[PDB]
Structure formats: structure tokens, C-alpha cells
Design a protein around this ligand. Sequence first.
Ligand SMILES: COc1ccc(C)cc1NC(=O)Nn1cnnc1
Ligand SMILES: [Zn+2]
Ligand SMILES: [Zn+2]
Ligand SMILES: [Zn+2]
Length: 461
Amino acid sequence: PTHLSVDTKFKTEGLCVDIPGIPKDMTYRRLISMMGFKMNYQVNGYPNMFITREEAIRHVRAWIGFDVEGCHGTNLPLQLGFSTGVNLVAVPTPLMYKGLPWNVVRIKIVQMLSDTLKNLSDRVVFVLWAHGFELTSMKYFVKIGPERTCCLCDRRATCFSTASDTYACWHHSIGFDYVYNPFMIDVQQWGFTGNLQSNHDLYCQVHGNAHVASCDAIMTRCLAVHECFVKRVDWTIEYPIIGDELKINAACRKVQHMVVKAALLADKFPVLHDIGNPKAIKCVPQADVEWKFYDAQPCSDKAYKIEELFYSYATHSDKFTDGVCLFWNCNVDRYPANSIVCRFDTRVLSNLNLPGCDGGSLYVNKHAFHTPAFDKSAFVNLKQLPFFYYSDSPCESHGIDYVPLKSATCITRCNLGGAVCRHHANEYRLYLDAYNMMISAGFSLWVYKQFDTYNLWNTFT
Ligand SMILES: COc1ccc(C)cc1NC(=O)Nn1cnnc1
Ligand SMILES: [Zn+2]
Ligand SMILES: [Zn+2]
Ligand SMILES: [Zn+2]
């Protein structure tokens, strides 16, 4: 059970309005044959055009919703819609394009998928709510065959060119006209009652139905993400490194240690309530503070209600008002005023952050985390945490050329003494790099209103 057997049954009830008379008994093998594709008994890495739900989840970065609506089926123009917002009209002679023949439409498809996916995935997975026309239109822009490599690099081939008779990956496909060996999954096969809009609207109010193919393509991919990442969550699935994952995670651990350590030194809290990851470790192991941990896995649907995080049933909760609360990526509706908070901003544009369900986003870095929509009102009791670098380490070099550092936010004994030493300047610039990496990845930092770095200077006496 590695791939989806071509002899698996495909429910054809969703297909019978575009294709009336379709057999109720249908296998993937017969469907693929009906679509105009010949697998010809080939054991070359492409056993089926269609993939399992499990394989689709492993390749979420490759998901592109796809819908086809009949504008007028051999003699009529089709509107091709993609979860990128693109609508192309193909004539058989929110971005809406005018009627053009397939030979030019297919060039645009390859360009669009290539620009969208080159930094996300080695493939495309068309996410469908299959009614018939999307499957029968594939033959006009898709070619299949054995698994191949790019003509310019070692990556797998995702495109084919009839002009040059060559294959390319998403990075080297300029001028290519066919999508080569794509994958697809039909959301309707999962067992739903009612149409696409009725199932999508149950979970999401951000995607409306403006009655174009791209709206359906968006809704289809949204509903798929809800089913695979919101209601059902899998933290055993690892995802490849496609960008700054390692640097971002390392920056996150540096910022956390810095901010929490300085909050403990500035306001000397006697107790810290660490609410979040059940596998969390003390980010400041040498701190005096009474460290108390509370387990809450990342919320993937709605933000946790703060009232429910403290709901102790028939017994008393701990006194959250005593000391400080640390919410490191533990997303709540409204933070207590005595908090240190790291909250991922779902609106961030990046190769790690994919569009999600109901305003939320699917953040993919080692694991997939569907995150609830960033909401500014969650931080009404707090303020934005300013950048600062703090260090009590000795002014000792141990060792990359140099320019003297002048900064009001380098909180060290040397800067108090009038001149930042080389070590603390090197460490300040590295910390500032890590800090900017974390902010630009989408993370935002918030703190209790009494926080003041001026209180850190007297820790050097
Ligand atoms: C669902 O939460 C609980 C369940 C049972 C019990 C006994 C306690 C809690 N909570 C709790 O004490 N949270 N806390 C965090 N910072 N101050 C208080
Ligand atoms: Zn290539
Ligand atoms: Zn939606
Ligand atoms: Zn120094």
C-alpha cells in the first residue's frame, strides 16, 4: 500500500451531470483511459495519475485547486479556474482572461504552475471536486509517461516541450507547453453529502462564491486543507527543507531565551506559567523563578479561549495573576496582561506559509501547522515587544573584519561603560540577524505593558 491502486473504485455520481450515463462501477484504470491517457502497463515511478489522501498530505505544498466550468464539451468554451485566482477561457476553434485556443492556454498554465510551485514542491497535485469537465479537459494540457529528470538539472521533470522534445522541472520550464506527470485527488471521493459550497461554508467564511471557476478551485483546496490539517492533525509527517527552516527555528530559540531571560531580570517575577507545547523545556535554565508548565498542543481550528485554558473543573486552577505567563506560539483569543507572547502572523507572504482555512494559514516548517487567523484584538492587554540585545557574559573576544558598534539597544556592561567590545558587537549583530529572520518569517512578539529595558542596566553594578 504505497500508491493508490488503479483498480480501486471511483464513485462516479459527482461526474454524471457533465457526463450523463457514466457507469456507477468504475475503476481509476477505466477513468484514466476515458480521460484519454494510456498507462500501457508501465512500472516507471508513475503508477496512477490519482493519489491517496495520505500521499496528498505528504505533498500539501504541491496543492493547486482546479475547476472547469462550461461557459457554453467538444464545441463549447471552458473556463479553467485555479486556486491561484486565475481564470482562463479556452475556445475549441479574480483574474479573468478572454477566450483563447488550447495551444496558447496550455503555455499560460505551465508558466503559472511553474512560478507558483518552483520554490514549494517537486510536483503539482490538482485538488478537484470532480464533476466531469475538469477530467476530460486534462488531455489538452497534460502529457504522461515514465518518471524523468530535467534537461538542465537533477530535479524531476514537471513540464514537457513539443517545440524541443525535452523535459524540465518548475525552474527551467520557460517556453514549455505541457504539464508532465501531474498528480490529482478528487475531494468528492472522501464521502461528502451535498455540493462543494455547502460543505466549504460549514468551516469557512473568508472564501465567497463569486460564481467563477477560480472561486470553486479555491473552496476545493480550502475544504481539503480543513479535512487534512484542521479537523485531523498529523505531527508524525515530516516535510523537506525548502528555505530558511533551520535558521528560523534557531532564531526562534535564541529570541525566546533572550526575551524571557530579560523579562525575569527586569521585573524579577517569582513564578512563570509556561502554557503551550507539552514537550517544552525551560528556555532560561539558570533563572531563579518557579517554572510551572501547562500542556496545550498548537490549536489548528479556532484560537484557544483563555477561559477554557484555566477551566479546572471541580478543582481550583493555579494563580495565573501571580508572576508572568509565557505563551510561545500558544494562540489564545485574548492574552492576560502579565504575558510574554510569540504569535505567528498568518497573513505573512512566504514559501513556508501556505493559504489556509477561514483566514488561517498552513505553516509548513518540518511539520504542518494550520494556524488560526491572526487577530490584533488578542493583544489589547499588551504592547509590541521592542528589539533589544541583552548580555551579562564577560567582555572577552576569543577568535571576520570589524566596524565599531554604536547602539542604544545593545544592553551590555561595555555599552554602559561607554564603548561596546568586539565580542558583544559580534553577538549583537548575530542576534539582530536572527531576530529579523524570525520577524520576517511571520512571528510577532508581545509583552506586558510595564516591560522596560531601562531596568536591565542596573544588572551591571
Ligand atoms: C485546563 O486547565 C487546568 C485544568 C486543571 C487544573 C487543576 C488546572 C488547570 N489550569 C491552570 O491551572 N492553568 N494556569 C496557568 N497559569 N495559571 C493557571
Ligand atoms: Zn531543472
Ligand atoms: Zn475557505
Ligand atoms: Zn562587552
